[model samples]
Target: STGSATTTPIDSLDDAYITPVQIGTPAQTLNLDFDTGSSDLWVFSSETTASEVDGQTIYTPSKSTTAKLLSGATWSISYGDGSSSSGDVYTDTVSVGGLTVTGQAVESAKKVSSSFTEDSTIDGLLGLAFSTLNTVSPTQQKTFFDNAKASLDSPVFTADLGYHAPGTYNFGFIDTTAYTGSITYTAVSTKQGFWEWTSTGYAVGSGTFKSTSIDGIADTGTTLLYLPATVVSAYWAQVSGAKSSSSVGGYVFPCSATLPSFTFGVGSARIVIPGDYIDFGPISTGSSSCFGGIQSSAGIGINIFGDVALKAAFVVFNGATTPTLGFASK
Candidate 1:
């Protein structure tokens, strides 16, 4: 069961991508943020407090005859950004693109944080990460992809993220037309329930490529690229006006600055991120200052290759045994 879906950026934020999904018998369609960083298919549902629902669509299990409650089962999840959601569990038909899964665990939200409640555009999250990360209690939950894998021709998905443009997420098959050049493959270590990999080295602009190794995760849910403090400092030092600003929370530079291209090595293949992409729009709308998309992963404990870094290349989340990542030019 090969399937593909078009994903669109969330307004001007570009922090995440959302794809339409259908749930239950009558097919209550909702837009979900496909996150590779976590594993829980949670949605804003009728169980959510009315005041907290905002303008976002909600999934009503009662409306679907096929919806069945998983009695006594519940889930709670907290994100790195301090946002959280908790809910009861339900088993229902879940559909993504042309793929379908029966009895898929759907965490129907009873409570959600202000961060989620305010984002009226996103109805829920469709986690693409390993099922081990699912937040359900007692019996753990499986992601939509995990549940549907048996029916899929291949346990694979491709993320084609575009800068300020629409992209596509292909499942069960890879679209060769979406990328250019060869897809460089790298072994992934899912020990931490993440698509973690090690980069050979990196460099600033056309500068010499260093031999230092960096371990990080490819997280589509995260908005910015995070590296070690030393690496971040070194990259920013190359920019004439770049500086670490506590008030701005990360490195900031003039919006007009011609930043250096940052390059990372994945085996023999080199993925270079254009300097302009490193400057994450403006620090604030109508401001000349811009925040650096590449930041220090000091407190986060692990480096993250977020959307800023990901949009620079086409990514294949190959779920075959050994779990590898295939990267190529967009």
Candidate 2:
């Protein structure tokens, strides 16, 4: 699906994000990141060995006056990347922003890679992103959104983002009145935790890229703008003047010249990424002057739009209501 048309997510009020859950017996307090890409929330635990986590926050039963352990249930998640975490399941209270909930089950990773181990900013992931990808599910698994949606101030939710802000992950009530009209929702395919939609068309360099395409999926687990090799190379070719840097994460390009600030037509809605998003830096040897979020993956069929690109807007994966993907002004 190289050069295939897709939907673009806009960046707006993609901040003010907060949610609540009961983590431990008395429920340890934790914040939730609005993730529409992954299904599970994995956090570091105090029980982790020093080698497992450098200086990250891990849940300690005693820290929370109310932490409870889910004795037999343990979960481990391995991503396509070498990143992995394994820990025992625990039932406790979790909180985001201000809302509160009880009896929430979460995975506490005793071991995590250096990439995530040292980051103190993000305690853990709050995966509200779509996914039927649960190893243990009986009736239906509860998500951060699923558990607190009814009690929040606004029944609807929206995410906002601001550059260099105190909190990059902002969540708040979905304001339907601000946008042109109501929020545009797309349907989810049951295969995985992907939001599939019809591509009306695509445009590159301010011109037309693709007229009509189909079967596009939106994911947050992916960390780069994964496209066909030809398309990737072609994209870089245009921004030939862009500068390159080094980092193991992904490409970090700093060229605003050739790359077009564009949008993808998802059905009738157009999701857009600002030009600043293209200016990635702190690159490494292998990662050249390409887009910061574009990575080269061999034989990984189907294009993946990763976090660097996704952080551009507010993405909502609401499985609680008819399994739909809602995109509003971030």
Top-scoring candidate (lDDT)? 1
The segments of candidate 2 whose C-alpha lies over 4 angstroms from its true place after superposition are 1-34, 135-141, 149-156, 163-173, 177-182, 214-216, 241-258, 285-291, 295-298, 328-330
lDDT of 2 by residue, 209-244 (tens): 565654445655454556555545555555645432
- Which digits, one per residue and each the tens of the lDDT, describe model 1 over residues 1-330? 988888999877577889999999899999999999999999999999888999999999999889999998999999988999999999999888888889999999999999999999999999999999999999998998888777788989999987888998889998889888999999899999999999888898888998888999999999899999998999999888889999988899888889899998888888888887786778888999888989999989999999988888999999887799989986
**Candidate 1 colliding pairs, count:** 0
Residue 24 in candidate 1, Cα distance off native in Å: 1.4
What local lDDT does model 1 show for residue 84? 96
Per-candidate TM equals 0.97, 0.75
Q: Go through the candidates in order and give the clash count of each.
A: 0, 56
